[PDB]
Amino acid sequence: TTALVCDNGSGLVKAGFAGDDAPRAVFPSIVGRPRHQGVMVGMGQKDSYVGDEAQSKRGILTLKYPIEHGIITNWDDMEKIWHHTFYNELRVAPEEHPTLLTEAPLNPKANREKMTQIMFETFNVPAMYVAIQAVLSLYASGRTTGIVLDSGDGVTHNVPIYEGYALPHAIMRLDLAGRDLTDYLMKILTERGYSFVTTAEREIVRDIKEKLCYVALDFENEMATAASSSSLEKSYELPDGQVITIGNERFRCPETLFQPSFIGMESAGIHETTYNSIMKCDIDIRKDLYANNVLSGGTTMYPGIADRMQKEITALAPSTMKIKIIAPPERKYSVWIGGSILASLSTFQQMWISKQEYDEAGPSIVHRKCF
């Protein structure tokens, strides 16, 4: 038999079998409902479009994300998404395939308990398991030591690992992520005269952010150059026309990751939370964590983030310390690669939460030694 590795994430579901080099099912975790009347009869219209199908009909649907920040806030939509993933994207029966799921640290217990209950009751999987999204990224990188930053779409967090031993007291979790960057881009695009309010325009703004935004090495210098020169202007082609031009907003949007005060958030930038998490650890393992800084997640693909963060950390770290950042090109899918690797081990086969164990011990077995 083979195991399935499902990475719900927040807004982009990636799933596939265990023992592959890449997922074969990547689509947004969105559910759409028709908000208009519908005059044609005999059309046989469906009441809910889930997955990449809803992206094709964004002009007649309202789109809802079942996951706000890691926590699932809508369980019927999550059930629909899982059913679609298991029966149409992967086209496999879950009655004979163990499933491996991922979730962020510092996650409410109710979310995990109900996820396991849904997996065991509705789909009736024979076994399942839940793992942190940072240990998997460490697995994919081929390392065994080093602080890992996993900035996805819902939650950004750092988890330090030394020699395969985690340090739970040094874990820092932040809710600033790609969705907040999209909202800030929406807020600042009205400065030039472009208004995007409907959830259909959310995907347009997200595409603009993915295609044009980049992180500047220096903020003040680029502001001085943009205010005087005009070489930073870049045009984008809307789904119909009236192409838009973006100036300093191109690099102003991703600055929130380093200056959270832009969106009114009290917390400090990621370049400082990483340093705080490093100093939260011991004193005899800080060298390896400095020299094994690992990046992952979709949000960490802005052009120039791996240089700005290195400069900031070198400014914060002692002068006699060397700082290295590992940013593989496959940052977005690193978690799934690590999950597939972990599920491929024969040693891991004894860590599955069997159906008999769940029946004996209730939904609370998940928080026991069988993590």
Partner 1 sequence: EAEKAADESERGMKVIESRAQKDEEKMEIQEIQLKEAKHIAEDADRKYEEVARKLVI
Ligand X SMILES: Nc1ncnc2c1ncn2[C@@H]1O[C@H](COP(=O)(O)OP(=O)(O)O)[C@@H](O)[C@H]1O
Q: How many residues does the chain have?
A: 371
Scanning residues 201 to 260, which ones bind partner 1 (CB under 8 A)?
Answer: 214, 217
Rule CB under 5 A: say whether 98 interacts with Mg ion. Answer: no
Rule CB under 8 A: say whether 287 interacts with partner 1. Answer: no
Of 66, 105, 152, 269, the residue at the interface with ligand X (CB under 6 A) is 152
Are the CB atoms for 333 and 14 separated by under 8 Å?
yes
Are the CB atoms for 141 and 294 separated by under 8 Å?
yes
Question: Taking the complex as a whole, how short is the minimal distance between the CB of residue 335 and Mg ion, in angstroms?
Answer: 5
Rule CB under 8 A: say whether 304 interacts with partner 1. Answer: yes
Which residues, in sequence order, are bridge partners of residue 7?
A: 14
Breaks in the chain (C to N > 2.5 A) come right after none
Task: Provide the H-helix boundaries in the chain.
Answer: 52-56, 75-84, 109-121, 133-140, 178-189, 199-212, 219-228, 249-252, 270-280, 286-291, 305-316, 334-344, 355-361
Rule CB under 6 A: say whether 157 interacts with ligand X. Answer: no
Question: Taking the complex as a whole, how short is the minimal distance between the CB of residue 134 and partner 1, in angstroms?
Answer: 27
Tokens of 355: 């159906």
DSSP state at residue 330? T
152 binds, among partner 1, Mg ion, a second copy, none (CB under 5 to 8 A by kind): Mg ion
Backbone angles phi, psi at 57, to 5 degrees: -130, 45
Scanning residues 120 to 159, which ones bind Mg ion (CB under 5 A)?
Answer: 152
User: Contact letters (x/-) for partner 1, 89-128, by CB under 8 A?
Assistant: ----------------------------------------
Rule CB under 6 A: say whether 11 interacts with ligand X. Answer: yes
53 binds, among ligand X, Mg ion, partner 1, none (CB under 5 to 8 A by kind): none
304 binds, among ligand X, partner 1, Mg ion, none (CB under 5 to 8 A by kind): partner 1
Nearer to ligand X, 24 or 368 (CB): 24
Give the strand pairing for 13-17 and 25-27. antiparallel
For residue 135, the SS3 value is helix
Are the CB atoms for 105 and 264 separated by under 8 Å?
no
* Alpha-carbon distances, residue 111 vs 103, 177, 222, 344 (angstroms): 10, 20, 43, 26
Which residues, in sequence order, are bridge partners of residue 156?
A: 151, 174
Scanning residues 182 to 241, which ones bind ligand X (CB under 6 A)?
Answer: 206, 209-210, 213
Query: Is 298 marked as binding a ligand?
Result: yes
Query: Is 209 marked as binding a ligand?
Result: yes
206 binds, among Mg ion, ligand X, a second copy, none (CB under 5 to 8 A by kind): ligand X
Positions at the binding site for ADP? 10, 14, 153, 209, 298, 301, 332
Which parts of this chain interact with ligand X (CB under 6 A)? 7, 9-12, 152-154, 178, 206, 209-210, 213, 297-299, 301-302, 332
